[PDB]
Amino acid sequence: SVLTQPASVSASPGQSITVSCTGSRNDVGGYDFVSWYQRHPGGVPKLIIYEISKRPSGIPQRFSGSRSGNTASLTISGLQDDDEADYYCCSYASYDRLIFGGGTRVSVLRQPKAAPSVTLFPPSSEELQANKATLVCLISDFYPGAVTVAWKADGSPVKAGVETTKPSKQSNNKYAASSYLSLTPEQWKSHRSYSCQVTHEGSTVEKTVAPT
Amino acid sequence: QVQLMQSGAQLRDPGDSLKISCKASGYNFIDYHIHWVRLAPGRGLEWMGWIDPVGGITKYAGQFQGRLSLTRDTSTNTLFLELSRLTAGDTAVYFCARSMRPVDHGIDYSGLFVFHFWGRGSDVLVSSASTKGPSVFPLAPTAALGCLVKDYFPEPVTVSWNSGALTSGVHTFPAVLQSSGLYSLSSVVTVPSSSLGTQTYICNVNHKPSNTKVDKKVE
């Protein structure tokens, strides 16, 4: 099971954000054993909150935790640069299990928001002649560094064959990422279009290519 | 003073076992349950299981039942993880972490359910490569055109354009790791259109591990 968290949230220094963590009566709702973990890019997770609202040693009270029904929430006030991280909720689950949320990127904005440039390439004729096919979705110049990518074949979602990179800081402090959809040529030619959908700060950019 | 010292990163074949260790210090070893947790791409943190150092009793998460074995050596304060029959889905950073508080059996288990002190992590990649040169494909087209540098191992690859003459508007993206355990990257140049057809564009790909140097014209 995966407790449900938003993919990302952002705000400016000195402001407050809240991250939700939605579970069930057999975990978040059923026991008072909800904890939160902070993880910096390339870093080690660190405990921020336990038993829903308690803070361990070293955590200031501007970090706070609550619960309503099956949803736990972490609030961070007075946002500082060090607060930019992935946050994970975690709950005991019946019986004798622990389950994590999928994580939320909290960004502390230090330059204006910038939407991603998206470029989608269809498979090349040379690749098809090698009996293979790859769609390439390139994502650049976005800020802050959090995106999600979804793929559509015609009007439908496609989950198989998708590999997506983490965002990488560019020279200009904006970010780049990319997503690859691997297909058989038969699969490629059997649809009328494929779409790459990039979501950033609540808005989705879509690019489409067609086999013909 | 609580410290968990993990063994390092590893590269493993599909079907191999993964064995990692975690040496504990700065506390009474037998008093604390130890957890293992991993951070896997496209997934958040994933709890794998805990072990009680007293009698070696464990609890495993459902998805690792039948493929995970947690053990302990009390005389060396060391914890071991063995994960069987690796697949690409097992590429992840593996952590050991200490429970918050000792268990009071039959009375209080609350401390079992919190990860307080963490190992530094063991970054694991599951791939059966083997040095392998890339296949380079043109990405046909201000306009954007590129080269796809597909299926190589290991890193890195370098890409230049027009024998080094073209640098403006060039964006070479970080590589993705495919479930095949092979890397792919793309390099894209944004050129003034009207210079299209007027100008030839060639990407020059270098993969030193396999000694491959490819030029690819992008029509």
Q: Calculate ∠ Cα B72-B78-B82, nearest 5°.
A: 55
3-state secondary structure of A7: coil
Kindly state whether residues B98 and B146 are assigned to the same domain. no
**Amino acid (one-letter) located at B9:** A
Answer for the pair B140, A124: CB distance below 8 angstroms, yes or no: yes
Strand pairing class (B78-83; A194-200): unpaired
Place of tokens 């495919």: B178
Residues of chain B immediately before an interruption (C to N > 2.5 Å): 141
Which DSSP symbol is given to B173?
P
In whole angstroms, what is the distance from residue A49 CA to residue A75 CA? 10
**Three-state SS annotation for A146-174:** CCEEEEEECCEECCCCEEECCCEECCCCC
| Amino acid code (one letter) for A56 | P
Start-end of H helices in chain A? 125-129, 185-189
User: Sign of the CA dihedral B151, B152, B155, B160?
Assistant: negative
Distance from the A83 Cα atom to the nearest Cα atom in chain B, whole angstroms: 18
Distance from CA of A147 to the nearest CA of B (A): 12
CA distance A181 to A122: 10
Please, which residues 142-201 of chain A have a Cβ atom closer than 8 Å to chain B?
Answer: 163-166, 168, 176-180, 182
Say yes or no: B161 and B201 in one domain: yes
DSSP B67: T
**Omega of the bond leading into B156 within 30 degrees of 0 (cis):** yes
How close A12 comes to chain B (CA, Å)?
25
- Considering only CB atoms, A33 lies closest to which of B35, B110, B177, namely B110
- B39 with B118, same domain: the answer is yes
How many domains are contained in chain B? 2
Residue B165: exposure state from Cβ atoms within 10 A (0-12, 13-18, ≥19): exposed
Q: Are residues B118 and B135 in the same domain?
A: no
Rounded to a whole number of angstroms, the distance between the first and last alpha carbons of chain B is 62
Q: How many CA atoms lie within 13 A of A80 on its CB side?
A: 4
Radius of gyration of chain B (CA): 24
Q: Which of B105, B128, B151 is the last residue of a domain?
A: B128
At which residue do the structure tokens 């402090």 appear? A173
Give the three-class secondary structure for B3.
strand
Distance from CA of A21 to the nearest CA of B (A): 13
Please tell me which of the candidates B137, B177, B185 has its beta carbon nearest to residue A124.
B137
B124 and B27 both lie in a single domain: yes
One-letter identity of residue B102: P
Q: Does A37 touch chain B (CB under 8 A)?
A: yes
Supply the DSSP symbol for B130. -
What are the backbone dihedrals phi and psi of residue B208, each rounded to the nearest 5 degrees, phi first? Answer: -60, -40
Distances in Å between the Cα of A184 and the Cα atoms of A157, A179, A181 are 17, 17, 10
CATH number of the CATH domain containing B75 = 2.60.40.10
Whether B109 and B143 map to the same domain: the answer is no
d(CA B130, CA B149): 17
Q: Do A124 and B174 touch (CB under 8 A)?
A: no
Q: Nearest-CA neighbor of B219 among B205, B194, B202?
A: B202
Q: How far apart are CA A35 and CA B177, in angstroms?
A: 32
Same domain, B134 and B113: no
β-bridge pairing B176-177 and B183-191: antiparallel
Beta carbons of A112 and A173 less than 8 angstroms apart: no
B164: left (phi over 0), alpha (psi -120 to 50) or beta: left
Complete domains list, chain A, with CATH:
1-110 (2.60.40.10), 111-212 (2.60.40.10)
Same domain, B117 and B136: no
Please give the Cα distance from A98 to B99 (Å, whole number).
12
Q: Which residues, listed in sequence order, are joined to residue B38 by a DSSP beta bridge?
A: B46, B94
DSSP state of B133: P
> Whose structure tokens read 């396999």?
B210
Which 8-state DSSP code applies to residue B76? G
Contact assessment for residue A165 and residue A158, using Cβ atoms and an 8 Å cutoff? no
Contact A89, A53 (CB under 8 A): no
Residue B216 DSSP label: E
Copy the structure tokens of residue B4.
């968990």
Write the Ramachandran bin of A164: left for phi over 0, alpha for psi from -120 to 50, otherwise beta: beta
CA distance A121 to A137: 7
Measured CA to CA, the distance from residue B119 to residue B43 in angstroms comes to 20
Tokens describing residue A193: 């279009």
Chain A residues in contact with B174 by the CB 8 A cut-off are 165, 168, 176, 178
Task: Print the domain residue range for B95.
Answer: 1-128
CA distance A75 to A61: 10
Token representation of residue A51: 């038993």
* Whether B15 and B121 share a structural domain: yes
**CA–CA separation, B150 vs B167, rounded Å?**
22
> Can you name the residues that pair with A46 across neighbouring β-strands?
A38
- Cis peptide, bond prior to residue B130, ω within 30 of zero: yes
Of A164, A211, A207, A178, residue with least CA distance to A192: A211
Q: How far apart are CA A179 and CA A183, in angstroms?
A: 13
Q: Could you tell me whether strands B122-126 and B10-12 are parallel, antiparallel, or unpaired per DSSP bridges?
A: parallel
The answer to whether residues B5 and B99 belong to one domain is yes
For residues A129 and A146, is the Cβ–Cβ distance under 8 A? Answer: no
Please tell me the distance from the alpha carbon of residue B182 to that of residue B91, in angstroms, as a whole number. 12
> Would you state the structure tokens that stand for residue A154, as one six-digit string?
């015609």
Give the CA dihedral B203, B158, A168, A40, nearest 10 degrees.
170
Judged by CB atoms closer than 8 Å, whether chains meet at A44 and B146 is answered as no
What CA–CA distance (Å, rounded) separates A44 from B117?
10
Asked if A143 and A113 count as a contact pair (C-beta separation under 8 A), the reply is yes
A161: left (phi over 0), alpha (psi -120 to 50) or beta: left
Asked if B45 lies within 8 A of A103 by C-beta distance, the reply is yes
- Final residue in a domain of this structure, among B128, B163, B178: B128
B155 and B77, same structural domain? no
Burial (Cβ within 10 Å: 0-12, 13-18, ≥19) of residue A74: buried
DSSP, collapsed to helix, strand or coil, labels residue A187 as helix
Structure tokens at B100: 């918050």
User: Are B90 and B11 part of one and the same domain?
Assistant: yes
Q: Which of B128, B150, B184 is the last residue of a domain?
A: B128
CA A32 to chain centroid, in Å, comes to 26
Other beta carbons less than 10 A from residue B135's beta carbon? 19
- Residue A117 CB contacts under 8 Å (≥ 6 apart), including other chains: A139, A140, A141, A142
Closest listed residue to residue A91, CA positions, set A147, A49, A143: A49
